[PDB]
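Hi D.,

Good news: the full-assembly prediction came through. Inputs first.
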Amino acid sequence: HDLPEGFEFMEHKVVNKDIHAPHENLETLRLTLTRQDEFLLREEPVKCVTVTGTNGEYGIYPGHAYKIVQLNPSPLTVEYTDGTTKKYFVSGGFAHINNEGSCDVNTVECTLLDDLDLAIAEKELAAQQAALGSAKDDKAKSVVEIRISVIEAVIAALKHH
Amino acid sequence: SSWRDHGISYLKYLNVCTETLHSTVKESRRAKYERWSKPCYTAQRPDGAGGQETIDKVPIHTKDY
Amino acid sequence: IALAGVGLGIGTIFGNLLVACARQPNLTKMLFNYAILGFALTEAIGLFALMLAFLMLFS
Amino acid sequence: ADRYQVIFNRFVSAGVQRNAVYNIPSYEKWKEDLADAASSDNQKNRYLFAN
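Then the structure:
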């Protein structure tokens, strides 16, 4: 009796480059954008991806050093080698960058910036501001601040372009 | 930012962010997106009488955080 | 006084070396070799300054 | 808790539903294993990830 492990059914493993190996010049980055155990892009070759981390923005191009990034509610840009830009907006998650030329961006929610609307964000922001004064306790204030920050980021992303 | 000092965990922060993001979605698409944030989960234990005693270990809604 | 900028430099190298050896333990040999190389290169400058000092002290 | 074992059903195909397991060790044990992988040559596949 030996139960399997759910990772055995997934054959698309992660390719980690060895320390003492020759370098390779890459022209494309394999992106893997995921939302709630669902991918929008499957190892798509792209020219670059811009992700807003906690410390600041990161522009990931092929060959970027191995790194882990804790995302914040913000836009995410993907520019293909053709010259086409695709912009999403994420609410949180992580981004794993591999020196072998892969970037796995696993977000709790990743939705097109077009799907978002402006007036809805404005009214929700006003409601949250009104409720902040009437916050039951400190925890409610922090939660309302979180929501207000998310809405402000959404509005800034929309107004930028 | 200030939510960590109050004991709020990271997962609850993610849930709040997603709920706000869904609330910011257009009218048409929200019908789909809202299905990924509506709480429909509860904790229960069977008592002697058969009633499903509901637990309060973790809040279900975001306003209860 | 030139040696003040030499010895300090050596420290800098070894400083960084430790940090590197902390985040790449399996690549210690190459880092140590490069650190020795840098130390010798700085010691070259140190010996130039020492030679000038000896020329001005013993003549 | 030493670990958190999740037991579920994996849907291989329309007529095949096996039983699969996810093991989630405690933060302390995970940290120890991660440090061992980062330092020691063992767990060579997680070396970069742990570091």
